[PDB]
Structures are given as C-alpha cells and as structure tokens.
From a paper:
They have been called BY-kinases (Bacterial-tyrosine-kinases) as they are only found in bacterial genomes. BY-kinase autophosphorylation on a C-terminal tyrosine cluster, called Y-cluster is crucial in regulating polysaccharide export. In firmicutes, the situation is quite similar except that BY-kinases are split into two proteins: one corresponds to the cytoplasmic catalytic domain of proteobacterial BY-kinases (about 230 residues) and the other is a transmembrane domain homologous to the Wzz-like domain (about 230 residues) of proteobacterial BY-kinases.
To test this and further understand why CapB1 is less active than CapB2, we solved the crystal structure of the CapA1B1 chimera. Clear electron density corresponding to a bound ADP molecule and associated Mg2+ ion was observed in the active site of CapA1B1. Despite the presence of the bound nucleotide, CapB1 residues 1 to 8 as well as the CapA1 last residue Asn222 are disordered. Phe221 is stabilized in this position by a T-shaped hydrophobic interaction with CapB1 residue Phe12 replacing the stacking interaction with CapB2 residue Ile12 observed in the CapA1B2 structure. Altogether, this data prove that CapB1 does not possess a tyrosine-kinase activity despite its BY-kinase signature and a 3D structure very similar to that of the active BY-kinase CapB2.
Author numbering: 197 to 221, 1009 to 1036, 1039 to 1213
The structure:
Amino acid sequence: DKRIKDEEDVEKELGLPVLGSIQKFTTLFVYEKPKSTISEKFRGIRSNIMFSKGEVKRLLVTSEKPGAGKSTVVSNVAITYAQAGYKTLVIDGDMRKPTQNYIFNEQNNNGLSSLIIGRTTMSEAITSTEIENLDLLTAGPVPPNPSELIGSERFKELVDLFNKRYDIIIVDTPPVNTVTDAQLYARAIKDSLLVIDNEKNDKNEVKKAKALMEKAGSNILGVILNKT
Ligand SMILES: Nc1ncnc2c1ncn2[C@@H]1O[C@H](COP(=O)(O)OP(=O)(O)O)[C@@H](O)[C@H]1O
Ligand SMILES: [Mg+2]
C-alpha cells in the first residue's frame, strides 16, 4: 500500500510537519459555522503556519493531484487570518480551473489573467468579500497561455505591490503533477503548504510534487492532511 495515512507517514516519508488535519464531511466553515470543530481546526492550521516560520507574508497552497482540497484550504485559512484582523488577499492562481469565485460567490469577469496583461485595473480586479479584512482576486477568464502570464514581469510586480498593502497573501494553484503552474508561482511566492488527500494518495506522487516544489525554490512550511 502506497498511501500516506498519518502524521507519522508524513514525517518519515516527506520530512515535513503536519500543520493540520481536516475531517471529511456550505463550504466557508470558518465564516458560516465558526463554532464547528472543523473551523477550530482551520484556526489551528493558522497557528501552525505561524510556528512553522520570520513571518508568513505570501503563501502558496498546492497538492500533488486534483481534488485534494487546495481550494477549500485556501478559502478557510484566509478567513482565519482576516478575522484575526490581518488585511488578507486570496489570489485564485488556478487559471485552468478557477474556483475561488464559486466558493465566495463573486463574479469572475475581471481577475488575475486580465490584470496581468493590463486589460483590467487593480481596483477592478480585486473584490472585497463579505468577510471583513478579506479581499479576493479571482482568476479572471481562462487564458490560452497560463504559464506565460504566471512567469511574467507584471505578475512579480503585482505581487510586490499587493504585499505593500496586504498583511498576508494566500494563493490557490493547480495541482503540481498536473501542470507546472505552482512551480512557476514559486518565483514570486517562496512559502508553501502541501495539501494531501488522506483517503486517496500515492506516496511517490506526493514526493515528486515536494521535490518539484523544492526544485522551484519553494519553502514547504508543512502538510495539511485532508478528508481524514
Ligand atoms: N475535508 C473535506 N471533507 C469533505 N469534502 C471535502 C473536504 N475538502 C474538500 N472537499 C470537497 O472535495 C472537492 C474538491 O475540493 P477542492 O478544494 O475544490 O479541490 P482542489 O484540490 O482541486 O482545489 C470539493 O467539492 C470539496 O467540497
Ligand atoms: Mg480547485
């Protein structure tokens, strides 16, 4: 059996700390249901991100394969920062299958893709959410040339601008073994979390993703075990 099943599997096989476990189970739990056991676990993840580091100003969230729960982690972890009084920007950096816009119920007409090429403005592309201190930069329209936008100069410089006025930036991404989008993001965003599907995963896949992220220069803060 190739599956990574727990904190011990994680430490031995990946040499990273488990920063939080989310149980299996209407999606923004930290907001909609602040009293749930699952919400507290997200606040625990925020706590462990703080112990893991220096302080975390930019965070990339990724996984080895689709469906791991990247997006759910991004959304909820971002909310725990906002409610703690930090100015927080979620960037939906998944321009292949954008999803933050559905999660927060915001319109994805302008977003990252069109911001990068300059077809929209910062004020236009960034939307304030219903959660105080939490802004959302949706993915924008799905571009033909994602790799090219991510590796661009406007992106690196937009991140720098954003980080002048946001305490923390949390960036959702496409799976690592699927496309190289996350590795490219690692140029502008050094710190990262790896989200693992506890019920369904391959030890070797997760190692490859970790190696790929480490090769792109990413500081992997730790792992989130999901659907445990
Ligand atoms: N802890 C969990 N328990 C149950 N379902 C989950 C959990 N985390 C994510 N999901 C579900 O799994 C699906 C994929 O999650 P998502 O975060 O969108 O995947 P991705 O890793 O591709 O971003 C979603 O429909 C979501 O509701
Ligand atoms: Mg997703």
